[PDB]
């Protein structure tokens, strides 16, 4: 479809219509365009380790994709996984350069263990993103503190 | 316009961001003397209006399907172009084709007399 763009005017949020032209919406500079990463715990999702694990799975045939966000939410619950296959070989890829853990986490749940790895990459079964430092990825990277959330695109007040 | 349909909503937003002011206390802009990776962020709070924050959470939920399909289409690993693309689309909507001064697709207003 089309990536929705949200307009904020006098503390009122409206979704921009791709067909309707609103001349009142003003964009004086690119600094008014912000991408926000809102964490799933804000939506009240279950944050315990056994319940969050059920939201992630392995699948081959889908290459990983990453987007940037400029602002994130302080997360009370973040996760850091070190899952390995029974034979000992690592099950998650080490994070490439530039990808760092979520900047602000209070409780970091160190998830470890050994299980069968059915695929090449760990994806979010509900469609959300694994939010890292200013980068939103579709894939869980080994040993890096992430916080599952989603991304919005806003045009901010002047 | 948005309306929240999520089960719950946290009406207060405690945020972090680097895209903010740097008072530039002398020699702190220099990376050698600059802050470390953990201290490059600023903070803030938007508890003022409960309704706007709950609307943001639904928008971030609703943009997910279109954003995920966007990433399926592109081939590069990391996509920063999205925000610069939205600005180009913004200008192309208003100033893309011929602009009729009093027309509906032209944001031109004649002077006040």
């Amino acid at each position: 479809r089309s990536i929705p763009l949200g307009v904020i005017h006098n503390s009122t949020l409206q979704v921009s219509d791709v067909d309707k032209l609103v001349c009142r919406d003003k964009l004086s500079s690119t600094n008014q365009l912000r991408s926000v990463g809102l964490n799933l715990e804000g939506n009240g999702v279950a944050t315990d380790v056994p319940s969050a694990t059920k939201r992630w799975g392995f699948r081959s045939g889908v290459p990983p994709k990453v987007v940037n966000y400029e602002a994130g939410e302080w997360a009370e619950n973040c996760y850091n996984l070190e899952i390995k296959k029974p034979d000992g070989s690592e099950c998650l890829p080490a994070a490439p350069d530039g990808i760092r853990g979520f900047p602000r986490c209070r409780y970091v749940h160190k998830v470890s263990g050994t299980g069968p790895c059915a695929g090449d990459f760990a994806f979010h079964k509900e469609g959300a993103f694994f939010l890292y430092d200013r980068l939103a990825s579709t894939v869980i990277y080994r040993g890096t503190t992430f916080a599952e959330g989603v991304v919005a695109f806003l045009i901010l007040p002047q | 316009a948005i309306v929240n349909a999520q089960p719950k909503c946290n009406p207060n937003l405690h945020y972090w961001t680097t895209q903010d002011e740097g008072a530039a206390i002398g020699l702190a802009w220099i990376p050698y003397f600059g802050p470390a990776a953990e201290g490059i962020y600023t903070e803030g709070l938007m508890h003022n209006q409960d309704g706007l924050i709950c609307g943001l959470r639904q928008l971030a939920n609703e943009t997910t399907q279109a954003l995920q399909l966007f990433l399926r289409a592109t081939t590069e690993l990391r996509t920063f172009s999205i925000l610069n693309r939205k600005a180009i689309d913004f200008l192309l909507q208003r100033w893309g084709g011929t602009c009729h001064i009093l027309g509906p697709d032209c944001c031109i207003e004649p002077h006040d007399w």
């Epitope: 715990e41 804000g42 009240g44 944050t47 315990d48 380790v49 302080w74 009370e76 619950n77 209070r106 409780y107 | 719950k8 909503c9 946290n10 009406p11 207060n12 405690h14 903070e43 803030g44 709070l45 508890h47 003022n48 409960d50 309704g51």
Partner: antibody, heavy 124, light 109 residues
Framework: QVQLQESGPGLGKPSETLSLSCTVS????????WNWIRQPPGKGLEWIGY???????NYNPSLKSRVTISVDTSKNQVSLNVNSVTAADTAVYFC??????????????????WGQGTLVTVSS | EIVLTQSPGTLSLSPGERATLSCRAS???????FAWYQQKPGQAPRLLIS???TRAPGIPDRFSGSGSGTDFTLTISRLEPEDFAVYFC?????????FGQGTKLEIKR
Amino acid sequence: QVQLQESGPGLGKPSETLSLSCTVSGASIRGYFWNWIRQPPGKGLEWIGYIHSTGSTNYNPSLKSRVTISVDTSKNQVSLNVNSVTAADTAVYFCARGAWNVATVYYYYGMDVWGQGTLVTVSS
Amino acid sequence: EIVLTQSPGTLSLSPGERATLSCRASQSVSSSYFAWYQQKPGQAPRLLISGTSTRAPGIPDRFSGSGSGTDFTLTISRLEPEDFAVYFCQQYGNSLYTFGQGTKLEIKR
């Protein structure tokens, strides 16, 4: 094992400024909201106000003029000052942690942790 | 303006019985983050139920919370002697809390 502890003078001279101090232990003040509740002896609870660790504050509509809440992250304390103190302000004063969720437990902005309460009698 | 009126004011009934405590909102809640508190003598109030229906950790299954937008209700089923306290309803909304009059509950014997 987070514990709150209010501190305040047992007697406050009338028409003066009254100061109480809440001291959080076993948990960092950063990232939570912190309330001030007062309870006149033998009556219901009244919410004085709340304050975030960053500093943004909103107070009770009926008391916003005579009150001012403040936080000090270096001391891990939240302070409360009431000015123009009369005899009605005689009460036990609580501080409470009204948080959206802590760790895996959701509290939905319900106040989970309270202080022990400090009684303040206002008399000449 | 946002005032929470609690009923009944006082109440006394025997162990085993069911106590139903009500609390009406003056204006409709714009954020249903309702809560119920139990205050033992000389103690700070304890959190029984938050978010209209979710029990706080360590609160027995007897305490159950429910609501309908304007009227919210707490039911203490199968009453035991330890439930002697005063119970307050609470409403967080638009960056402010409000409490209720309180319901003083006596356990007969």
